[PDB]
Design a protein around this ligand. Structure first.
Ligand SMILES: Cc1cn([C@H]2C[C@H](O)[C@@H](COP(=O)(O)OP(=O)(O)OP(=O)(O)O)O2)c(=O)[nH]c1=O
Ligand SMILES: [Mg+2]
Ligand SMILES: [Mg+2]
Ligand SMILES: [Zn+2]
Lengths: 645, 222, 196
DNA sequence: TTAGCTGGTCAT
RNA sequence: ACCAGC
C-alpha cells in the first residue's frame, strides 16, 4: 500500500503538463520524490504497485487525480496507462461516509479553522483539524512576489516548476498519510483484527463492510458520468431568452403606470421612489393602501406574500384585480431568467467547447445518503407542469449529439422507479401487520387509487399529500394541500390512520429504540439521547438530526441505497453483456437525479437492451438484501428529456 | 461568492443570513447589508442623487452601477456622467443639462470609454455611441452582459476605437449599434446590427425592444 | 532621473527572483538589486565602466516601465566590468537572459548583456568594436522573433572578423527555455552553433 | 408544538 | 424569506 500525491498545471478540463509527484510506501518508509523529467519512472512505480497486487491511496483520486494521469500519459509521451478501479482507493470518499456530519460538530473548533474552512472535506481543512499544517503554497507565493516586486497576475502559480511546489507536495502527502491513519483507526467500519496497510485487493474490499465498497463503486461511476456530460442545445435556449426578455420589459411598463410612484422619507429629506415588482415590500404597501386585509401573520408585524396569497386576494379597484396576475407572471419570468441565462451559475455560463454541460455530483452530501448536485444544479430545472417547462427540458436532450462516424443523432432512455419510499415503508412494517399491506401496492397502482379514496384533484396532489401525512406533519400543513381547514386536516389524518394501524406502532418502536427521555421546555426541547445513530441497510451509522424526523431518516436513507446499488448493477450487467461505455462505444450515462436515470445510446436495439436489463438489475437489488416487497421500475424512450421525464 | 449560512444576529433567524467570501453578510428577512474646469465634481459637493430617467425609461440600479448621477448645483439639474479607467478611478467627467452645456471636466484622455471598468472577459460586447443607448441596453439585459460606449461621439470611431485594441482583443465577438462601423477592430470579429428606428432608445419607447434583443444575439457579419 | 541611487537611500536588498528562476548568489555576483522607493518595489540593474566605477542604474517597476538614472551611454554593457579575457562570450539581449546563463553555467564562462536591445544593437556593437579584441569567439544569443533574427543579421556586420556564431532556441528567448526545463538545449547551443 | 433532503438568490 | 426538484 502506497500513498502518492501529484501536482500539475491546471484543472482536469485543460491539463497538458506534469510538474511533480511524491510517493510514500508502507514497506520501505521512503519519501521517493520525482521531478518533471521523471514521469516515466513515476508511471513505472505505480504500474509495479498494481502488478504486484497492491492498493494505491490517493486523495480526491477518482474525480481528478487518476484521469489526469491517464490524460498526461497519453498526450505527453504517447503511452496507454489505466489503473483498475479495484486498486485505487480514495481518502475523500472515505471521509464523506465516516465523517458525514461536520456542520453539527465543527462548532467549538472554530477558534483552529479560519472560518472559510467551516465544514470542508478538503485536504487543507484536515491539515488545520489534525494540527499538522506548515504554511500554504498560494499565500507564501503571493507574499514572495510582493516581496520581490513583480505583480501577482491571475492567481495561477502552477505555470512554472520550482522547489516550493515539491516542498508543499511533500507536506500534502504527509497530511494524506496522517488522514489515512485516523480513517483506518475506526472500528465500526474496519474491524481491529487485521492491519489494513499490507492486505491485498481481495482482502481489503471483502474483509470489511459493504458500505466501503458500494461507495467507491458509486464514486467511480459518478465521476465517469461527470466526465461524459449532458448534451445541450444553445440556440433553443437563446431563442427562449430573447423571447421572455421582451416580456418582463413589458410587464413593468404596463404596471408602473398602474401602481404609481411615491415620496419616501430618506427639512425632511424625501426621495421619488418608484414601484419595483420584484420586491415584496412595495407590493405589500400598495396592497395595504388599496383595500386589502391579509388575515395571515407569519411575521410579527408583516404579512406573508407568496403565490398562495396572491391568488386569494381581492381589492375594490377592478384594475388592480387584473394587475396582480401580471405581478405574479413578472415574478415567474424574473426567476426563469435568473435561473436560465443571467445568474452567476446559469446554464449558458457552464457550456464547454463541445456543447455539453458538466455538473458536479456529490454522492454523499445529505445525512441520509442522498446525492447532491451542484455547479450547476441539474436536479432542479423546471418540470413539465410549470410554465415554460417543456421549453426548458427540450434543450437538455440526447439527440443533440450527432455521431462522429456516421453523422446521426442518438436515442435516449430514461428509467424511473415507482413507489420507492412508500414501498420501503411496506418493507419495514411488514413484521407488524404480517404483510397484508405489501400486497395492495403490488395490486394495481397506489397513487391513483389513493387519489380515488381521498378525492384529490390530481395524482401529484395525492402524491404530495401521502408523504406529507407520513413524515410527521401538523394539523394545518396537510389541510393546506387541499386548501381546506384544520377540520379536514384532522379527518384526513384519522381516515389514513385508522386504515392500517401499524404506522403508529412502528413510530412507537422507533421511539422506544432511539430516545429514552425528553424534557419539555415552553420554548425549546431538552433531550437525553441513547442512540443518536441508526444502522442502515449496510451497517452505515446514519445520523439522526431531530427526534421527530426519525421516520424520515429511516425511510429515505434506506431508499437512497437501493438506487445507489441499482445504478451500479445496471452497468455491471451491460459491460459484461458485451457493450462499451463512453461516447465512442454504445451507451453513456448523462445524469442521476434522486430517483431516475438518464442514459443515451446509439441505436434503438441498444435502448431496448438497456431498458430490459434495468429490470433485472433492480430485481437483483431486491433479492440481494431480502426485501419483503417486490421492486419494480418503468422506462421510457425518446429523443430528449421532455418525453423521457 | 457564496459560502454558507450564518444565524442572523439582528433580526434573529437561523438560516436567513448568508455569508460571502468577501467578508460581508446579507439577510433575506431583514434585508440588511453589512461589511476645461480641471475640477472633478465631488458627489457630496453637488447634491448628487441617483434618480431615474422616467421620460426615457431607465431604472435606478442601472444608474447606480453605471455611474450616471444627477447634480443639483446652482439650483439647476445636471446629469453628470463619470468616465473611469481599469484601476477603478475617476479620471474625467461630462456635465450635461438641457442646453447641452457639455462641460468636460478633468483630464479627458483621448481613448476613454464609458463602462470599461467593469468587464475583462467574455464572448460578446455591444458598442454604442452615446450614453442613454448604453443605459438602454443595460436596462434590457439587466446590467450583466458587457456594453461599452464611445466617449467622443460618432466622429472619433477611427481614434477612440483604434487606440483601444488590446482591450477589444480580449473578447470573442464585437457588435456595433451606431446609427440606423469600424474595421480597426480585429479581423473576422466585427458584427454590425440593423434596427428599424433611429437608435436603441426609439426602439425601446415604441415596444420594438424585442428587435433590440434579437439583434444582439443574431447579428450579421461585416 | 536623480543620481546613482545609493542603497541606503533606497533600502537595498539582494534576493532571488521566484517568478523568473534566478537564485540570490547570481544576483549578488552581477549587481541586480531590489529597492523600495516611493512605496512601490522597484527592480534595478547596476552598470559600471570597464574599471568598475559606478555610473548608471536602470529601474523597472511592477509593469516594466523604463527609468534611467542619468547619462545612459553607448559604451556600457550590463556586466562589462566582470570579464577581461577568456575564449568565449554569450551576448544576450535583455538583462535576465544574462542572469539565466550565469545561473545555468555557474559563473564560469563569460556572459555580457546589452543595455539597449534590438533597437540600437549596432550602435552599441560598432561602438564596442574595441572591447572584443581580447576574446576568441562570440556566440550571439538573441530573441527568436522577426526582430531577433533581424537584429542578429544586422549586428553580424559590425562585429569582428568571422568569429560570430549564432545560437538558435526553441523558445522566445533563454529564460522561457529555463522555465520550461530545457536546460539540456542551451548547454549545447553555447558550445556549438550554426555560423553566418 | 413541528412534513423532510438539497441548491440559488444579494447590496455598497 | 421566496422559487425549483425528487
Ligand atoms: C413528492 C415527494 C417525493 N418524496 C420521495 C418519495 C418518493 O418515493 C421519492 C421519489 O419521488 P417520486 O418519483 O416523484 O414518487 P414515486 O416514485 O413514489 O411515484 P411514481 O414514480 O410512480 O410517479 O421521493 C419526498 O420525500 N417528498 C416529496 O414531497
Ligand atoms: Mg491531490
Ligand atoms: Mg419515481
Ligand atoms: Zn437579518
Amino acid at each position: 500500500m502506497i500513498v502518492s500525491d501529484i501536482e500539475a498545471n491546471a484543472l482536469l478540463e485543460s491539463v497538458t503538463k506534469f510538474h511533480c509527484g511524491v510517493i510514500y510506501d508502507y514497506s520501505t518508509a521512503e519519501y521517493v520524490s520525482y521531478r518533471p523529467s521523471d514521469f516515466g519512472a513515476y508511471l513505472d512505480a505505480l504500474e509495479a504497485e498494481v502488478a504486484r497486487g497492491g492498493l494505491i491511496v490517493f486523495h480526491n483520486g477518482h474525480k481528478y487525480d487518476v484521469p489526469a494521469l491517464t490524460k498526461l500519459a497519453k498526450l505527453q509521451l504517447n503511452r496507454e496507462f489505466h489503473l483498475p478501479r479495484e486498486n485505487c482507493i480514495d481518502t475523500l470518499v472515505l471521509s464523506r461516509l465516516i465523517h458525514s456530519n461536520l456542520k453539527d460538530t465543527d462548532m467549538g473548533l472554530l477558534r483552529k479553522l479560519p472560518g472559510k474552512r467551516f465544514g470542508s472535506h478538503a485536504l487543507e481543512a484536515w491539515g488545520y483539524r489534525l494540527g499538522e499544517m506548515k504554511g500554504e503554497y498560494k499565500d507564501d507565493f503571493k507574499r514572495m512576489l510582493e516581496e520581490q516586486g513583480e505583480e501577482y497576475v491571475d492567481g495561477m502559480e502552477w505555470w512554472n516548476f520550482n522547489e516550493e511546489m515539491m516542498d508543499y507536495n511533500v507536506q500534502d502527502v504527509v497530511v494524506t498519510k496522517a488522514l489515512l491513519e485516523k480513517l483506518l483507526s475506526d472500528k465500526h467500519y474496519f474491524p481491529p483484527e487485521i492491519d489494513f496497510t499490507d492486505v491485498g485487493y481481495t482482502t481489503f474490499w471483502s474483509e470489511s463492510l459493504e458500505a466501503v465498497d458500494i461507495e467507491h463503486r458509486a464514486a467511480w461511476l459518478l465521476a465517469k458520468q461527470e466526465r461524459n456530460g449532458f448534451p445541450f442545445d444553445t440556440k433553443a435556449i437563446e431563442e427562449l431568452y430573447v423571447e421572455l426578455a421582451a416580456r418582463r420589459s413589458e410587464l413593468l411598463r404596463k404596471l408602473t403606470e398602474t401602481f404609481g410612484s411615491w415620496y419616501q422619507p430618506k427639512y425632511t429629506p424625501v426621495e421619488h421612489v418608484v414601484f419595483n415588482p420584484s420586491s415584496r415590500d412595495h407590493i405589500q404597501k400598495k396592497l395595504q393602501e388599496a383595500g386589502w386585509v391579509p388575515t395571515k401573520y407569519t411575521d410579527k408585524g408583516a404579512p406573508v406574500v407568496d403565490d398562495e396569497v396572491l391568488e386569494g386576494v381581492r381589492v375594490d379597484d377592478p384594475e388592480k384585480q387584473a394587475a396582480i396576475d401580471l405581478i405574479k407572471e413578472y415574478l415567474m419570468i424574473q426567476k426563469r431568467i435568473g435561473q436560465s441565462a443571467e445568474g452567476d451559475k446559469a446554464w449558458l455560463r457552464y457550456v464547454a467547447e463541445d456543447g455539453k454541460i458538466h455538473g458536479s455530483v456529490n454522492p454523499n452530501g445529505a445525512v441520509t445518503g442522498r446525492a447532491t448536485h451542484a455547479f450547476p444544479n441539474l436536479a432542479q430545472i423546471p418540470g413539465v407542469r410549470s410554465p415554460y417547462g417543456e421549453q426548458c427540458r427540450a434543450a437538455f436532450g440526447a439527440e443533440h449529439h450527432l455521431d462522429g462516424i456516421t453523422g446521426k443523432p442518438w436515442v435516449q432512455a430514461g428509467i424511473d422507479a415507482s413507489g420507492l419510499e412508500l414501498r420501503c415503508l411496506a418493507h419495514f412494517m411488514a413484521r407488524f401487520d404480517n404483510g397484508e399491506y405489501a400486497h395492495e401496492i403490488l395490486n394495481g397502482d397506489i397513487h391513483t387509487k389513493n387519489q380515488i379514496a381521498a378525492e384529490l384533484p390530481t395524482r401529484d396532489n395525492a402524491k404530495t399529500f401521502i408523504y406529507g401525512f407520513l413524515y410527521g406533519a401538523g394539523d394545518e400543513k396537510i389541510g393546506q394541500i387541499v386548501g381546506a381547514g384544520k377540520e379536514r386536516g384532522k379527518e384526513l389524518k384519522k381516515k389514513f390512520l385508522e386504515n392500517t394501524p401499524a404506522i403508529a406502532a412502528l413510530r412507537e418502536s422507533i421511539q422506544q429504540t432511539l430516545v429514552e427521555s425528553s424534557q419539555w421546555v415552553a420554548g425549546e426541547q431538552q433531550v437525553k439521547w441513547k442512540r443518536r445513530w441508526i444502522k442502515g441497510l449496510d451497517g452505515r451509522k446514519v445520523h439522526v438530526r431531530s427526534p421527530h424526523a426519525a421516520l424520515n431518516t429511516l425511510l429515505q436513507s434506506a431508499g437512497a441505497l437501493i438506487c445507489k446499488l441499482w445504478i451500479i448493477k445496471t452497468e455491471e450487467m451491460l459491460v459484461e453483456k458485451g457493450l462499451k461505455h463512453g461516447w465512442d462505444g454504445d451507451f453513456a450515462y448523462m445524469a442521476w437525479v434522486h430517483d431516475e436515470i438518464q442514459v443515451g445510446c446509439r441505436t434503438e436495439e441498444i435502448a431496448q437492451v438497456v431498458i430490459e436489463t434495468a429490470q433485472e438489475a433492480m430485481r437483483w437489488v431486491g433479492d440481494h438484501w431480502n426485501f419483503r416487497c417486490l421492486l419494480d421500475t418503468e422506462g421510457k424512450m425518446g429523443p430528449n428529456w421532455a418525453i423521457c421525464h | 461568492v457564496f459560502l454558507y449560512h450564518i444565524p442572523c444576529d439582528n433580526c434573529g433567524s437561523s438560516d436567513g443570513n448568508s455569508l460571502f467570501s468577501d467578508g460581508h453578510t446579507f439577510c433575506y428577512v431583514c434585508e440588511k447589508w453589512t461589511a476645461m474646469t480641471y475640477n472633478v465634481w465631488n458627489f457630496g459637493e453637488s447634491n448628487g442623487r441617483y434618480s431615474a430617467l422616467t421620460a426615457r425609461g431607465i431604472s435606478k440600479e442601472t444608474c447606480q452601477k453605471a455611474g450616471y448621477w444627477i447634480a443639483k448645483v446652482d439650483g439647476v439639474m445636471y446629469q453628470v456622467a463619470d468616465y473611469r479607467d481599469q484601476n477603478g478611478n475617476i479620471v474625467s467627467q461630462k456635465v450635461r443639462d438641457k442646453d447641452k452645456n457639455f462641460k468636460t471636466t478633468g483630464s479627458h484622455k483621448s481613448d476613454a470609454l464609458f463602462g470599461k471598468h467593469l468587464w475583462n472577459g467574455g464572448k460578446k460586447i455591444v458598442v454604442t455611441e452615446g450614453e442613454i443607448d448604453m443605459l438602454t441596453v443595460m436596462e434590457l439585459q439587466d446590467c450583466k452582459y458587457p456594453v461599452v460606449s464611445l466617449g467622443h461621439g460618432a466622429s472619433a470611431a477611427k481614434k477612440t476605437c483604434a487606440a483601444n485594441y488590446e482591450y477589444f482583443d480580449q473578447f470573442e465577438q464585437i457588435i456595433l449599434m451606431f446609427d440606423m462601423a469600424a474595421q480597426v477592430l480585429p479581423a473576422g470579429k466585427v458584427r454590425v446590427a440593423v434596427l428599424p428606428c433611429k437608435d436603441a432608445n426609439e426602439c425601446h419607447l415604441n415596444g420594438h425592444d424585442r428587435e433590440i434583443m434579437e439583434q444582439v444575439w443574431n447579428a450579421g457579419p461585416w
